[PDB]
């Protein structure tokens with residue numbers, strides 16, 4: 001764990017925007 | 019998806035209860051990924067909704083659409099922006115490519131009654147993108 | 156257009172100086188200290204000094220004043236930017252900014268100063284580039300500085316491609332003594348610590364209000380930053396054209412984007428203070444803190460600083476949640492709380508005596524500031540959409556990002 | 571599922587309940603809260619922020635969140651309106667000039683859709699001087715009888731004497747808890 | 751923690767207590783303090799500043815800080831009000847003209863929130879002439895019976911004779927110490 005918010009995975013781009 | 023199947027009946031019941039016409043902050047689950055729904059994911063969600071029912075032929079409403087988007091985000095982490103309808107007047111195509119659900123008239127564009135209808139060609143034909151090339155970038 | 160940039164000391168001794176143009180005599184540094192002393196004693200002290208026809212612009216450093224004397228009408232903003240770059244380079248190279256490292260790395264310090272700027276025009280400003288050519292423990296200059304991409308060194312190889320982002324949120328609230336918030340601005344901070352192989356070009360994508368409106372998706376929660384500043388590697392052309400945040404990520408921790416817009420929402424922590432101060436008899440601290448943030452978010456390390464009397468002594472604290480400690484050096488009592496869950500209501504009752512003899516002069520009413528910091532909270536509601544990591548060789552990246560919400564200029568005016 | 575644990579907890583008392591402390595400044599709200607929690611007339615500085623305390627009576631811990639009547643603290647009562655089940659209004663029968671302000675504040679607090687499940691709790695504070703009104707004149711002036719869909723009761727409580735606080739607590743418990 | 755040392759100290763007597771010496775000039779306050787400390791009628795110059803002394807009685811060292819009744823020394827009594835647990839007022843029953851001034855000074859001293867835990871201590875000084883009033887007339891004139899939340903007792907003490915000082919000391923000890 002880590003203070004200030006756990007790290008979260010990020011996507012590559014807006015998949016719904018084509 | 020057992021969780022998605024379980025949440026589908028509750029989501030459908032909530033949408034049906036809401037008529038067709040309190041806490042502040044933006045909490046985020048720890049380690050939960052957030053990304054927009056993909057074309058394949060949108061197609062799978064549309065197929066699951068069509069198979070389970072409660073999505074095709076239901077009266078389109080802002081509250082029902084928001085509830086469905088929130089349920090989808092809770093169940094899979096997909097952003098509640100791919101379930102958008104094409105600008106009116108008339109049948110609104112899905113905003114995100116691959117979506118099999120679209121809103122069509124059932125009878126001002128706001129006062130027009132809209133109903134969700136399954137569209138298999140939507141997942142393969144970019145009708146919304148063709149209609150609004152500027153919105154698609 | 157400073158004539159020469161030099162590093163001073165707290166006693167007026169110049170730790171290190173390096174003339175760049177030679178149009179200003181090195182003896183003018185001696186008169187800088189008396190001028191600063193006279194300005195401080197009269198309230199006219201300014202960072203940009205003026206010794207006759209030569210201006211000695213100085214910046215208050217950690218332990219020495221970075222005085223950059225100038226003669227002609229040089230770019231004051233350019234001089235300040237050069238001083239900031241030099242300070243950043245020194246901080247990167249030396250972990251301590253004091254006289255201990257000023258006189259300990261003079262051999263490399265002189266070389267770094269010579270390579271940084273020549274004839275008053277800075278040339279090298281990249282910490283990585285400077286470290287790749289000048290070290291304290293020499294080859295030809297790197298081609299990265301000569302090449303267009305001066306913020307992403309090529310040829311870097313790593314076992315894994317992991318990038319750690321940080322969604323830093325600064326909640327600044329300017330609440331006047333009347334109970335109304337005057338300055339309520341939240342400044343975003345998108346800083347990513349990219350550590351991968353090669354020189355990938357990051358494709359930043361978030362739930363921007365402008366981007367959502369342009370794409371036709373302006374119906375969900377989108378963050379509309381009033382001021383958005385891109386990093387050095389961020390291409391301004393793509394952002395001006397279609398808001399495309401495409402740039403080469405740097406090697407290490409760097410600030411890609413920093414949102415800055417006003418906030419129209421209620422404060423995360425609502426603190427009401429009561430001052431039952433008797434006339435030279437006693438003092439009352441009726442401080443009540445209300446958590447306006449979501450109950451699912453907890454403000455870790457919340458320290459609501461309540462300024463106590465300057466001459467107050469023998470104070471008693473009667474609170475409910477959170478330890479209260481009076482620091483004589485700070486002349487105030489901080490309502491420190493380890494964990495502050497949202498919606499919590501903490502009430503405190505301070506009581507301390509006062510000296511019989513009245514104070515000769517007033518001490519003022521400094522504003523009360525809190526140090527609340529609740530991580531994993533997105534008050535602005537801006538959610539990152541995707542990060543386009545593309546490499547010529549081709550690899551699967553695993554970027555990560557964390558949202559941190561803290562209290563910035565959250566000062567409440569005293570009664 | 572099994573509710574054996576719930577039945578066991580309720581056999582010896584598990585209900586707690588909630589309460590709110592609101593009203594005009596100098597209306598005895600802080601004194602009323604202190605009497606409910608401690609039981610003595612202790613002089614305190616004005617409540618710049620808010621006071622949080624709990625009182626246990628009849629096996630129910632009715633926590634009361636005291637709110638000051640200050641101008642800078644009057645709009646801060648909305649923060650305590652979240653996750654609040656009760657609301658107590660402190661009336662100042664000895665402050666004719668501030669009576670209108672207290673009535674306006676009570677109407678504003680009761681005119682919110684969020685504060686709908688909390689019944690009216692009007693305490694006739696300052697019941698120690700002959701100028702204090704009765705339990706009907708104050709209610710008639712405040713118009714509590716016309717507040718439909720709200721369980722508002724007028725009770726006279728004197729901070730110095732302490733009489734009437736038990737009646738108000740019993741009325742609040744009856745309004746909140748409707749069991750044997 | 752352990753309180754064995756405290757119990758051992760209290761077994762043989764550890765309580766000391768405090769006292770104050772205030773009143774109008776020529777009211778026997780200095781004489782009363784000298785009698786409490788030494789026990790003799792010694793002639794002294796007027797107290798321009800203040801007199802500090804301690805008297806040990808009943809295993810309690812009741813220190814009395816004598817304060818003059820001079821105009822330049824009357825406002826200096828606030829300095830001794832800090833960290834003070836007792837307050838003794840010296841009345842001048844033989845000074846009818848100065849009786850009003852002494853009463854006003856006593857009211858001003860008792861009208862301070864800091865001096866609230868110190869009970870009233872009125873000594874009928876100058877109890878050697880027929881013009882001196884009784885223990886009830888002086889209290890009625892000074893209005894000590896209407897001083898609520900203050901343990902004020904009227905005692906007649908003559909500086910020349912010394913009678914009544916023991917009664918006043920016992921009353922002060924009872925007001926301060928409430929143990930066996």
Ligand SMILES: Nc1nc2c(ncn2[C@@H]2O[C@H](COP(=O)(O)OP(=O)(O)OP(=O)(O)O)[C@@H](O)[C@H]2O)c(=O)[nH]1
Pocket residue numbers: 594595596597598599600601613614615616617618637638639640660695696697698728729730731
């Ligand atoms: N002395 C006295 N005061 C009373 C009586 N009844 C009501 N009060 C009032 O109760 C107040 C007590 O002050 P607080 O403890 O601060 O409580 P409050 O009335 O809510 O005032 P705030 O906390 O500042 O909002 C006094 O100021 C009086 O005005 C009474 O019978 N006797």
Ligand SMILES: Nc1nc2c(ncn2[C@@H]2O[C@H](COP(=O)(O)OP(=O)(O)OP(=O)(O)O)[C@@H](O)[C@H]2O)c(=O)[nH]1
Pocket residue numbers: 774775776777778779780781793794795796797798817818819820840875876877878908909910911
């Ligand atoms: N001779 C005599 N004097 C008395 C008697 N009772 C009270 N006094 C007064 O006590 C005073 C003693 O003076 P001080 O020792 O200075 O004490 P004080 O009365 O407080 O006067 P200051 O210290 O100046 O404030 C005399 O001046 C008398 O006025 C008494 O029975 N006989």
Ligand SMILES: [Mg+2]
Pocket residue numbers: 599600601616617621636637638
């Ligand atoms: Mg109060």
Ligand SMILES: [Mg+2]
Pocket residue numbers: 779780781796797801816817818
């Ligand atoms: Mg004397």
